[PDB]
Amino acid sequence: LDKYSEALKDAQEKLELAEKKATDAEADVASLNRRIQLVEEELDRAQERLATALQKL
Amino acid sequence: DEDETTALVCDNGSGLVKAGFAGDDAPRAVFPSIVGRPRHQGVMVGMGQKDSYVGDEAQSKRGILTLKYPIEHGIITNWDDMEKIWHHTFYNELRVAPEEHPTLLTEAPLNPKANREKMTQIMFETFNVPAMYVAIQAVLSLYASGRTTGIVLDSGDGVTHNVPIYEGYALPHAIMRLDLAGRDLTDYLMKILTERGYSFVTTAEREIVRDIKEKLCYVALDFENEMATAASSSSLEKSYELPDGQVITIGNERFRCPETLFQPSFIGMESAGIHETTYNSIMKCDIDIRKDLYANNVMSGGTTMYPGIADRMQKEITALAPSTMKIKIIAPPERKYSVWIGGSILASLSTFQQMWITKQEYDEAGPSIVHRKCF
Amino acid sequence: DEDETTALVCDNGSGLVKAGFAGDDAPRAVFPSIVGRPRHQGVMVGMGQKDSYVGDEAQSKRGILTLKYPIEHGIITNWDDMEKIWHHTFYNELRVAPEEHPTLLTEAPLNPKANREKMTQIMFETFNVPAMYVAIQAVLSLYASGRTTGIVLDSGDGVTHNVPIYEGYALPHAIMRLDLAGRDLTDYLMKILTERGYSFVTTAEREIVRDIKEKLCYVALDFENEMATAASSSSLEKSYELPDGQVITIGNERFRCPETLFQPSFIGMESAGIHETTYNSIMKCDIDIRKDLYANNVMSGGTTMYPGIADRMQKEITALAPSTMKIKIIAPPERKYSVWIGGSILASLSTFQQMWITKQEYDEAGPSIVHRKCF
Amino acid sequence: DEDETTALVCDNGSGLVKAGFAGDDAPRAVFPSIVGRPRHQGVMVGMGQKDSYVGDEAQSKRGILTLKYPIEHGIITNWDDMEKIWHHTFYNELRVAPEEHPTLLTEAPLNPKANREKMTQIMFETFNVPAMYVAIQAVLSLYASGRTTGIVLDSGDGVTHNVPIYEGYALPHAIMRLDLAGRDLTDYLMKILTERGYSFVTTAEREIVRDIKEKLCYVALDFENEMATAASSSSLEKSYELPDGQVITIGNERFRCPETLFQPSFIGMESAGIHETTYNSIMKCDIDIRKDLYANNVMSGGTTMYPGIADRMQKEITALAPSTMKIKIIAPPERKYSVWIGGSILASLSTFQQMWITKQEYDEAGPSIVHRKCF
């Protein structure tokens, strides 16, 4: 029991840490997707503004 | 037994009381919000036996006790039983006498005023606490979760308050209070287990169904498809060992119970579910707030521990939300314990040390002071 | 039952629908603007029972119905429910088929265009009305109240429109449309009644709160002094009888809700209140207009039915207004019915017979014709 | 810290506030002319949160703030809030205390005297600026444009100035100052979008509409042909993304709002419009000075970015103007920023160093000195 309880506190702690890693990694998948979309949007806008600048050119 | 005069925190829900001292990351002990009383005639002489049992005593001797909850849908009505629970909690098990420590209690912002007033009165008059502070669950949940901004949907045992906060500010016009909570989900389960041949009608039986629910139930991200197979095969059933050697298995009842969160009509409530109330709390906030609340949907309270709840709630809001917006759920392991943890955080913040009612102001004003000094 | 093809008149809001015939001085029937639907599963058979209930049917059977209205903040978004309301209104209570009678409907001056356009389309295509005319609620209020000049303060269930008119002309740049209304007062009152220990969360409960508000609440002239005694003694409480024989007593809540009109922040609204808003409509008008608008602030609609409102508004407006100038409020008994009555008047006036869209012009142009023919 | 003690330059409008140092070709920063204040009750503690926010802080935290503008129609009505803006603009953002640098501010030549006097007073008494000079906005527009002759029509958020200048001299009898401006176009758009089904009334809603206007609106050089199609077909509509992911489309309203500059009656204003005021600024000057003003219509300020405004301002003038004569609009890229740029140019002129009020002359004479030394 102590071995299963301890194996568990460790599987569970490793899990909280892996889940945290996933949470933080996911927080970053999301922060990266926000930056990617902000930058892709600025890029598409740079390209819209470029197409416009080129049209205005 | 503590070596510092820290504040005490006691999260007195309609279910269980989580308590410990301020500054920690967990309650030191958890007691049920129960005072138990014998429903039988004593036969033997010299057996001891109490007129009433408190907290864990009430559950330990429950075989012949009727177990009552002093708090109904979040509000204390039986203050005498509350005082018994608090005395046991603070003096016998947590080993903190309130006389030497300031105390923080918790409650929904729309919890009727008698709750915050009576809790304040008892800690000052029967416990002689040097100071008091009744905190709000939405505040406590955002502190526990590491947020200043978000929707707190506390799917606890009593009442769900659904309260949006932005940059630390309440957005009260967007609060959607719902008369649906974990206690009702348990009651629904008892009726559907009766349909399957397992009738639970007495206190011992009720406490057992709650324990079964906590270990066996899940939300399902597609109720109808999950039910189509749960109702057709034993392959989706899970067993539980009853205390008397009997066993029970649960099939679609396993998910129909938490489904009431998405379908309150299951218990007779006129509501579209916790995801519509969450959605409306985001939607009813100003247009420049909405984007931040969609991305910071905070699950709190108990029932947040049903598998799949953190994901189904993101799906249900995403389905109602405008495109472009990011919808995201916050659901840490500090779930169900988040209100207590928020209490610990808040009680010990330097920014909160001016929020405490001292036992000076209290006697000059009386317990109604809580409505001016706390919330 | 009529001996002439008199126009039919209906004033349709988010609250109630008042309907009758042109030339009369009151509606023949009043219905809530509601279509009710059962929220429970039928168990017995041969019980009658409708799929949907309309108007007073929805209210009489409300114990088991969810009640929804088609109009939000002055605009019809659910034309199907209004079609049902109108069919019932016209054929069962007014006992008239619109096919033989022209119809006058109303809307606020800045109401989104879809309202007047859809209303015109339904009366011409589902009722085959020979003619249509969508009236300005402010015009109707001025006729019913005996004015050509003044500020129309309708403060209704949907919106407060605050619209100045001079010599029968619109001064549209000075309209202060405000998102402060009777439906927000109903919501605010139930939150403060929750604070007192009475939960109102279902439809039946919502309509009860609306009824409580209408009979027990007031504004008075001095909020702080009224609160000082209402919050201190039962001598300022009033009992309201709940349908099951139980009662609720209401204290300072009796005025704290109505106070929202002067303090919109109570419901989360960014506004200075109705007295300042009325003042601003006057201040945005030319100085040779202002003298007549100050002397003619006119109440219509609803919520203007709170005790102390005509007298407090005069006090609050004169306090903002220049000295020497005379500030007066007109607050006729034709309160809550005056927009409908004005509809009856506009329809009966010979000066209005050229203003009708005929069911010739309508089909040649389509419903968009309403924007060329009405206002 | 700076290479030389050149003047700080700042153009304080009813819309935007812009600043940088004398000698450069752009302001370092642009702020809205806003001081923001929380309109909500705080519940969380230690969330930071200011009692008041300034400039971009006020706009960035606007979700729970009510935002006020200290400047209206070209003048400061709230100097305390401008003091906060100037501190932020000059010291927090340009990182220069006015104490060590001359400051150049701006105002229209027919701008009420109290405003040019208050700007002089605050910079000398609260910021201890060693010197002051409040620039003529038309002059700065000419400096940035590279003109000495022309009509400066600055169509900003506050007021349209319409001033004829010939060879560096003003012709003051011909100035048509007009209370028609970009702020009215924003409010008109909030009301017209309400007519389309997208209501806007609150601060957040007004800031959205100002953003819609700035990205979607235009004047249309031939509005009759433009509306004949725009009011008939969706092919002329343009979509805008709101902060919460909603999409609004605007058709003829897209140019009808800016059209108010030519059609002031749309907002209840009695005026000939900006093209006729340009015409009269030219026509009211002597005939040997009009032949140069017709050929030099100088566009400045904001709202000048709407496509079609330059061509729409040249066509209308040409129609009012005598035949044979050449009518020409000057509409440089230094638009909206031309006053700030001209300020930089004025501040760096060697001949301008004799135009400064020193912080000696100021105290001997008081703020009325601005009329003895500046204009």
B117: CATH? 3.30.420.40
Check whether residue D285 and residue D155 sit in a common domain.
yes
Quote the CA–CA distance of D136 and C218 in Å, as a whole number: 55
DSSP state of D61: T
DSSP state of C160: B
Q: Is D129 strand, coil or helix?
A: coil
Quote the CA–CA distance of D84 and D78 in Å, as a whole number: 10
Q: Which CA distances in Å does D37 have to B353, D41, D186?
A: 25, 12, 22
Q: Is B147 strand, coil or helix?
A: coil
Neighbours of B192 (CB within 10 A): 17
Check whether residue D124 and residue D91 sit in a common domain.
yes
Per the structure block, which two tokens stand in for B72?
Answer: 């109904």
Q: Which residues of B touch D (CB under 8 A)?
A: 136, 138-139, 142-143, 148, 165-172, 285-292, 321-325, 346, 349-352, 355, 375
Quote the CA–CA distance of B346 and B10 in Å, as a whole number: 12
DSSP state of D42: B
Quote the CA–CA distance of C99 and D34 in Å, as a whole number: 57
Residues 6+ apart with CB under 8 A from C50: C38, C57
Residue of chain B whose Cα is closest to the Cα of C188:
B173
How many CA atoms lie within 13 Å of C212's alpha carbon, on the beta-carbon side? 32
Strands C65-68 and C35-38: antiparallel
Boundary (domain end) residue, out of B224, B246, B267: B267
Check whether residue D324 and residue D299 sit in a common domain.
yes
Check whether residue D166 and residue D315 sit in a common domain.
yes
CA-closest candidate to residue B130, choices B3, B1, B7: B7
Tokens 């009383």: give the residue.
Answer: B37
Per the structure block, which two tokens stand in for C222?
Answer: 């001095």
Quote the CA–CA distance of B171 and C193 in Å, as a whole number: 19
Question: Starting from the edge strand earliest in sequence, which strands make up the sheet with B65-68, in order?
Answer: B53-54, B35-38, B65-68
Check whether residue C15 and residue C109 sit in a common domain.
yes
Per the structure block, which two tokens stand in for B92?
Answer: 């016998």
Check whether residue D120 and residue D27 sit in a common domain.
yes
Pick among C40, C73, C199 to test the B interface (most B CBs inside 10 A): C199
Find the helix or strand (DSSP H, E) in which C54 lies.
strand C53-54
Boundary (domain end) residue, out of D251, D267, D283: D267
| Amino acid at the residue D213 | K
Residue B163: domain span? 136-181+271-332
Burial of B38 (0-12, 13-18, 19+ CB in 10 A): middle
Neighbours of C205 (CB within 10 A): 16
**CATH value at residue C40:** 2.30.36.70
**Which resolution, in Å, applies to this structure?**
7.8
DSSP state of B40: S
Q: How many domains does chain C have?
A: 4
CA-closest candidate to residue C158, choices C133, C128, C186: C186
Which residues share a beta bridge with B163? Answer: B152
DSSP state of D337: T
Whether residue C177 and residue D269 make contact (CB cut-off 8 A), yes or no, is no
Distance (Å) from the alpha carbon of B121 to chain A's nearest alpha carbon: 41
Chains A and C touch (3+ CB pairs under 8 A): no
DSSP letters, D140-197, are HHHHHHT-SSEEEE---SS-B--EEEETTEE-GGG---BS--HHHHHHHHHHHHHHTT
Per the structure block, which two tokens stand in for B347?
Answer: 């009680």
Quote the CA–CA distance of A13 and A8 in Å, as a whole number: 8
Per the structure block, which two tokens stand in for C362?
Answer: 């309508």
**CATH value at residue B196:** 3.90.640.10
The C-alpha R_g of chain A, in whole angstroms, comes to 23
Residues 6+ apart with CB under 8 A from B59: B32, B34, B36, B67, B207
CA-closest candidate to residue B293, choices B169, B157, B117, B208: B169
Q: Which residues of D touch B (CB under 8 A)?
A: 38, 40-49, 61-64, 202, 204-205, 207-208, 241-246
Residues 6+ apart with CB under 8 A from C33: C12, C13, C14, C15, C16, C17, C69, C70, C71, C81, C82, C85
Quote the CA–CA distance of D294 and D279 in Å, as a whole number: 8
B210 touches B72 (CB < 8 A): no
Q: Which CA distances in Å does C92 have to C1, C24, C78, C85, C169?
A: 12, 18, 21, 10, 38
Per the structure block, which two tokens stand in for B1?
Answer: 């037994």
Boundary (domain end) residue, out of D43, D68, D93: D68
Per the structure block, which two tokens stand in for D15?
Answer: 């819309």
Neighbours of C82 (CB within 10 A): 25
Which residues share a beta bridge with D65? Answer: D38
Distance (Å) from the alpha carbon of C168 to chain D's nearest alpha carbon: 16
B-chain residues within 8 Å CB-CB of A29? none
Check whether residue C16 and residue C92 sit in a common domain.
yes
Tokens 């603070």: give the residue.
Answer: B90
Distance (Å) from the alpha carbon of A16 to chain B's nearest alpha carbon: 8
Distance (Å) from the alpha carbon of D5 to chain C's nearest alpha carbon: 45
| Amino acid at the residue B13 | G
Residues 6+ apart with CB under 8 A from C187: C267
Q: How far apart are the first and last CA of chain C?
A: 32
3-state SS string over D261-314? HCCHHHHCCCCCCHHHHHHHHHHCCCHHHHHHHCCCEEECCCCCCCCCHHHHHH
How many CA atoms lie within 13 Å of D234's alpha carbon, on the beta-carbon side? 3
* Vertex C192 angle, CA C190 and C193, to 5°: 60
Check whether residue B46 and residue B165 sit in a common domain.
no
Residue of chain B whose Cα is closest to the Cα of D66:
B286
D106 touches D293 (CB < 8 A): no
C93 touches C10 (CB < 8 A): no
Quote the CA–CA distance of D34 and D67 in Å, as a whole number: 6
Find the helix or strand (DSSP H, E) in which B313 lies.
helix B309-318
Q: With b meaning 16 or more CB within 10 Å and e meaning fewer, what string describes C125-160?
A: eebebbbbbbbbbbbbbbbbbebebbbbbbbbbbbb
Q: With b meaning 16 or more CB within 10 Å and e meaning fewer, what string describes B207-233?
A: bbbbebbeebbbbbeebeebbeebeee
Quote the CA–CA distance of D363 and B25 in Å, as a whole number: 62
Check whether residue D241 and residue D230 sit in a common domain.
yes
B-chain residues within 8 Å CB-CB of D61? 167
DSSP state of C150: E
Burial of C85 (0-12, 13-18, 19+ CB in 10 A): buried
Whether residue D245 and residue B324 make contact (CB cut-off 8 A), yes or no, is yes
Quote the CA–CA distance of C22 and C5 in Å, as a whole number: 9
Directed axis angle between helix C203-216 and helix C182-195, to 10°? 100
Per the structure block, which two tokens stand in for D372?
Answer: 């003895």
B149 touches B139 (CB < 8 A): no
Check whether residue D209 and residue D92 sit in a common domain.
no
Chain D adjacent subunits, 3+ CB pairs under 8 A? B, C
Residues 6+ apart with CB under 8 A from A7: none
Check whether residue B142 and residue B80 sit in a common domain.
no
Q: Which residues of B touch C (CB under 8 A)?
A: 75, 110, 112-114, 171-175, 177-179, 265, 268-270
Per the structure block, which two tokens stand in for D102?
Answer: 């001359």
CA D110 to chain centre: 15
D127 touches D102 (CB < 8 A): no
Chain C adjacent subunits, 3+ CB pairs under 8 A? B, D
Check whether residue C186 and residue C212 sit in a common domain.
yes
Find the helix or strand (DSSP H, E) in which B306 lies.
none
DSSP state of B160: B
Quote the CA–CA distance of B335 and D301 in Å, as a whole number: 56
